[PDB]
Ligand binder design. Structure first.
Ligand SMILES: N[C@@H](CCC(=O)N[C@@H](CS)C(=O)NCC(=O)O)C(=O)O
Ligand SMILES: N[C@@H](CCC(=O)N[C@@H](CS)C(=O)NCC(=O)O)C(=O)O
Lengths: 205, 212
């Protein structure tokens, strides 16, 4: 295929890209990379991504080699998702896109505490503190969804793609949270999307 | 009554606010600033939290487009696409992405390392400094500078052929790090780029102010 994706399936950031590719019905070749798969710390990979992280996406059609999951999602949307996942109007686009930055700058670090502490390990305090932080972030997201159906606004979009893989993990590590009805309604609509069920709804490991 | 269509909330010594001030100045857009953050308050008021539940700055209102927007990088990309076509916005998705990745990286990778140093040397007195943490922050930032130096080996700007929003995202952090009394391993491509920035009137106006 013209598109190559490096990354493992149990990565939030890789999931964003796999999910976008599936939503847009784009063909791609996956190369397992990260963790016990290696590849991502090889000299040849570091020449493509000096951070040595996944995902990495190559698009031979546009001579593109791109890292940063959110940039990859926005690229795929603009290039292949016109009138589907790309919002043309800058202001309406921004209202959704802010949630991409927020997903990685605010939600991800709180999520990391839980995924590390519970799944891939423990420090009662640490974790309990991360749970409180995530519960508070869930309150914020619940309010954000009080008057619109999607983080991207009127329609499902790239803000929703950025946030949901983290939320998926947090709702599947045996924890029970304060009920958040707007957030839960939103999550249910994601579970109805075949691409989400395929890519995101897999075991937490 | 001398009021503008764009309102910006935030204090001048914030990296994230600087990105937006700098963009507004590059595009020669009129704006009204409302000081907010730190000792200025405003950002934890109920009225402000209703606009930005994170209670952080910057926040930008654009009355022309009925927009109320937080996240500095999203604000910069908005201004570029709306007001900076053929100046700061790169139309081609792939060529745009090559620059825009550096916006994500600035805030996800550079910012946390910068934060250690800014908090430690600028906003903590010597008697309370964690010298170990600062030294580790310095090591980390020196390694990130090596990465940025290599990235600039074969192109003039993070945004590619021309100055752009990837450059805007990275530079305010680099400015602080170069103005806190530290000497770094030389990085010739990074230094050449930084000098380029110092020749831009909007950068001199907004970014090149005292580190406090
Ligand atoms: N800012 C990057 C973060 C990427 C990242 O942290 N990737 C992780 C997986 S979630 C990784 O490569 N970890 C090292 C490994 O798996 O070997 C992005 O959003 O794409
Ligand atoms: N992710 C946000 C982060 C904003 C942020 O951290 N703002 C800081 C200033 S750099 C702030 O508001 N601190 C609280 C304060 O100044 O009271 C963005 O990029 O705009």
């Amino acid at each position: 295929s013209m598109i190559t994706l490096w990354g493992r399936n149990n990565s939030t950031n890789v999931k964003k890209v796999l999910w976008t590719l599936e939503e847009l019905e784009l063909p791609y070749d996956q190369i397992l990379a990260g963790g016990k798969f290696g590849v991502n710390q090889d000299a040849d990979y570091l020449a493509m991504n000096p951070n040595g992280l996944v995902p990495l996406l190559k698009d031979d059609e546009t001579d593109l080699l791109l890292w940063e999951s959110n940039a990859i999602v926005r690229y795929l949307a603009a290039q292949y998702g016109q009138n589907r996942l790309w919002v043309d109007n800058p202001a309406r686009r921004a209202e959704g896109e802010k949630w991409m930055d927020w997903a990685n700058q605010t939600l991800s670090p709180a999520h990391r505490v839980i995924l590390m502490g519970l799944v891939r390990t423990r420090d009662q305090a640490a974790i309990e503190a991360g749970i409180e932080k995530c519960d508070s972030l869930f309150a914020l997201l619940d309010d954000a969804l009080a008057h619109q159906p999607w983080f991207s606004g009127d329609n499902f979009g790239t803000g929703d793609i950025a946030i949901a893989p983290f939320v998926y993990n947090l709702l599947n590590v045996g924890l029970k949270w304060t009920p958040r009805p707007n957030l839960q309604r939103w999550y249910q609509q994601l579970t109805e999307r075949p691409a989400f069920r395929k890519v995101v709804m897999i075991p937490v490991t």
